[PDB]
Amino acid sequence: VEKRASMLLFECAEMRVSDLHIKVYDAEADIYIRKDGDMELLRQIESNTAHSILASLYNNADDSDATYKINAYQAARIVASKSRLALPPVIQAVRLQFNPLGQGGRYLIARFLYTDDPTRFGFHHSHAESFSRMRNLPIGINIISGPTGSGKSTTLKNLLELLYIEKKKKVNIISIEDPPEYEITAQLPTEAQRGEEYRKAITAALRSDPDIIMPGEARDAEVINLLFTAAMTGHQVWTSLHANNALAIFDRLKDQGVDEFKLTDPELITGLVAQRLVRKLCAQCSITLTEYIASGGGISDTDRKIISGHETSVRFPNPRAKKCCRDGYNGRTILAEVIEPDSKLLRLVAEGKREDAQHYWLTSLHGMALKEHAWLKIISGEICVMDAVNKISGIDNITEERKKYLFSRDNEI
Amino acid sequence: VEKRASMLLFECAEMRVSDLHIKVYDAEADIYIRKDGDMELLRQIESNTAHSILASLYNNADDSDATYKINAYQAARIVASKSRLALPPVIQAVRLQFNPLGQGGRYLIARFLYTDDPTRFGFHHSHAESFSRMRNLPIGINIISGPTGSGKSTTLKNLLELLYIEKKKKVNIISIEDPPEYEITAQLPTEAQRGEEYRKAITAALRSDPDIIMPGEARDAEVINLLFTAAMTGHQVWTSLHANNALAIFDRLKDQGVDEFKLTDPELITGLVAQRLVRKLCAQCSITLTEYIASGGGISDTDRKIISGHETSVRFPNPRAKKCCRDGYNGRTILAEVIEPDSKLLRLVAEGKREDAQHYWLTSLHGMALKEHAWLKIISGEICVMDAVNKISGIDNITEERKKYLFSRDNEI
Ligand SMILES: Nc1ncnc2c1ncn2[C@@H]1O[C@H](COP(=O)(O)OP(=O)(O)NP(=O)(O)O)[C@@H](O)[C@H]1O
Ligand SMILES: Nc1ncnc2c1ncn2[C@@H]1O[C@H](COP(=O)(O)OP(=O)(O)NP(=O)(O)O)[C@@H](O)[C@H]1O
Ligand SMILES: [Zn+2]
Ligand SMILES: [Zn+2]
């Protein structure tokens, strides 16, 4: 039924979920939504209605092979301005993935791409200073790394507005994003055809005077090679990648053929940012450790080790669903690490040491990693310890001297 | 005759054997079964009846070339829900391998794939702690290694239930197993076609949001490359491999093209497990060393060296087939080694030293190898020394200081 699918899509748009999952078990079908970073169960619908709405979603999808193919895997895309499903204006495009499940079952995954203050989202002040210093440099390449729900596009858009303000419209800015998402310059619009179109758009942007290229993501190795050659040509590149800890970026680049002599130059690789998104506790409804352990308190030994020393400072989510917010959580915040490479740091990284290179960054360069930022926001009470240790590993490995140094540097500023 | 083959399959299912071997010598045919880890002789059947039942098994098999091909090698598969042989519900699929044997003889091998408490199967407490620590980490790749009868699928299923309990259904779990074996998430279902289907299923699982990928085995190099790229993308992988001693995993990976820069990072390779299955003595019927040597005692010099120091503690199988159990053995237990890699350990392994790297793991990392666990279960009396030295080599090479340290660490806990 088209109507039930339309109501489901409107409900998911108004509730602002990220992904939608539908699992059919031939008795009852589970409908799950991905709100913020955690998954939750939406509904237990009937199997026949779920099969009907999945069939309708496949039929009104733009890509279809005229076979439902219960036993076979399928992919499809629904694009706005041509849709009999009467899509809401909030959702621009929906990417549907259909998978077989057991015997006569279906698994539908929907990505729900959306078509929709100047600074200090969740970053530290040192990260803001590094961002300003990186924006002041005319020549270089910047790479943003993290998992899928990092929010790299929002950071790139905010940096683009900051470049608008700072540069006084004296430079040319080009933006090459195949899916138009959010206001952002010249917005330049199967998988192989999309990749070929993206490569053609990048080449056409390079034929003109790009100054700042601002590419969208980096899937292919040829794309990254073209971006690197344009960066050594004399332009500025702000790209995004999938990596961890702001040092696996080099591992993700050497896998595709960037070669070691390009990554050694500190003038080329201007900055590296690795960020993650975690849920933020509501400020109106927060409880102390004693109030948390008073009613159903569950704390592990590592969590107790992290809290120890600042037991009164930490905060926990408040149950009972008070008037403010929804469930004691108010949005999300970014924990990030920003590195400005040096000659010695890049020389140590290129040798593949992986030891005394992170130490050099933390001690000599006065750098801060993602674990220290997560611990600082744990002590400040902005985020819960359980969410931080679920998202990030290694928080309990911070030494006492490092914690004392971080507290001293936070108090002296 | 279909009836005799049906009775043979029912007998093998009720007796719970692993593999079935039929050898034809044109005078009398040997029927052998693989119960637990050891092979034994089931029956001495007539050659004509064996040829007839093998011909019937080939004819009712799904794959057939309409030629019996006595002189040629053949392979076939029998799948449930489409079988004129009236398969028992316990057996899902049977893989038949037919080989020539001498002049006019046949060799049939049947794998007998079966379609069918929360922790502490045979693992040590340190292994359980390492398992919990590995389950707490959000990003990484875990590899389970061992011979064919290790029981890696059972360990992976138990870890999946433990992840169900721990994660509180806040993450998405996908399972990609081409043969559906045992309850386990979204269960995603010639050799080249099967490999292509497996690769397509893995790609389709990667197109959605996998979080935890949980792949089934690793046959091809492209599959392992895709798993590694997904692990550096930011997902978690629990895969199984065929290797020994938890350090030949790197040798099995470098053979297929993982490259050295991917294996150096300790944040990527989160843990390595190598396990084996040995027979456990029945607790009701156990005899001491004196009772064993009283009647038909056969002990070697190396076995005497291993037993020496704890002669009264060891136990031996009890003959005469008492009321309990079957032959003095009660099930099987796992002897395993679990390593959490470090930067120095991975640097030493990547250099190909093979010396002072195992020493670093045993001394600095306080690790325990499979030989020490086997010796500890020998001293505790859970398993027999002969089975342990048949399954595992190098038990007699443990020094006296290491044995004293193991006994002290077992007594202090
Ligand atoms: N402080 C915040 N910073 C960034 N994003 C936030 C923040 N708070 C909430 N969000 C939301 O987090 C969501 C993730 O942003 P998004 O740019 O879509 O991630 P992404 O890296 O582009 N995902 P993908 O393209 O699939 O790899 C955004 O839609 C934000 O609305
Ligand atoms: N403590 C135990 N732990 C694991 N398996 C056990 C144990 N006790 C008995 N078993 C049985 O050992 C058998 C081997 O398990 P299995 O998962 O089939 O090994 P495998 O590694 O998957 N073999 P293969 O796929 O051919 O490489 C299982 O069927 C168990 O029933
Ligand atoms: Zn609130
Ligand atoms: Zn017994």
Author numbering:
A (entry chain A), B (entry chain F): 107 to 222, 231 to 298, 301 to 305, 311 to 534
Text of the article:
Type 4 pili (T4P) are retractable surface appendages found on numerous bacteria and archaea that play essential roles in various microbial functions, including host colonization by pathogens. T4P are composed of thousands of copies of a major pilin protein arranged in a helical array. They are assembled and retracted by a complex machine composed of several essential proteins, including a dedicated extension ATPase, most often called PilB, that is essential for pilus biogenesis. Here, we report the cryo-electron microscopy (cryo-EM) structure of the BfpD ATPase from enteropathogenic Escherichia coli (EPEC) in the presence of either ADP or a mixture of ADP and AMP-PNP. Both structures, solved at 3 Å resolution, reveal the typical toroid shape of AAA+ ATPases and unambiguous 6-fold symmetry.
Purified BfpD was prepared under two nucleotide conditions: either in the presence of ADP (BfpD-ADP data set) or in the presence of ADP, ATP, and the nonhydrolysable ATP analog, AMP-PNP (termed BfpD-ANP data set) at a ratio of 2:4:5. For BfpD-ANP, a data set of 9,853 good movies and 424,708 good particles with well-distributed orientation yielded two classes, with 214,673 and 58,944 particles, respectively. Subsequent 3D reconstruction with C6 symmetry yielded resolutions of 3.1 Å, 3.0 Å, and 3.7 Å for BfpD-ADP, BfpD-ANP class-1 and BfpD-ANP class-2, respectively. For the BfpD-ANP data set, despite the addition of ADP, ATP, and AMP-PNP, the active site of all monomers was fully occupied by electron density consistent with AMP-PNP, suggesting that ultimately ANP occupied the active sites and remained there. The presence of ANP in the catalytic site results in an outward N2D movement, stabilized by interaction between Arg 217 and the γ-phosphate. BfpD-ANP class-1 has an outward N2D compared to BfpD-ANP class-2. Comparison of the BfpD-ADP and BfpD-ANP structures reveals a subtle outward shift in position of the N2D with respect to the CTD such that the mobile innermost N2D loops delineate a circle of 65 Å in diameter (distance between diagonally located Ala172 residues) in the presence of ADP, and 70–73 Å diameter in the presence of ANP class 1 and 2, respectively. The N2D moves toward the 6-fold axis in going from ANP class-2 to ANP-class-1, likely reflecting two successive steps on the way to ATP hydrolysis. The ring contraction from class-2 to class-1 is accompanied by loss of contact between the ATP-stabilizing Arg217 and the Ɣ phosphate of ATP, and gradual shortening of the distance between the catalytic residue Glu295 and that same phosphate, priming the active site for catalysis. As Glu338 and the catalytic glutamate Glu295 are 5.3–11.6 Å away from the γ-phosphate of ANP, it appears that the ATPase captured by cryo-EM is a prehydrolysis intermediate between the ADP/ATP exchange and ATP hydrolysis steps of the catalysis cycle.
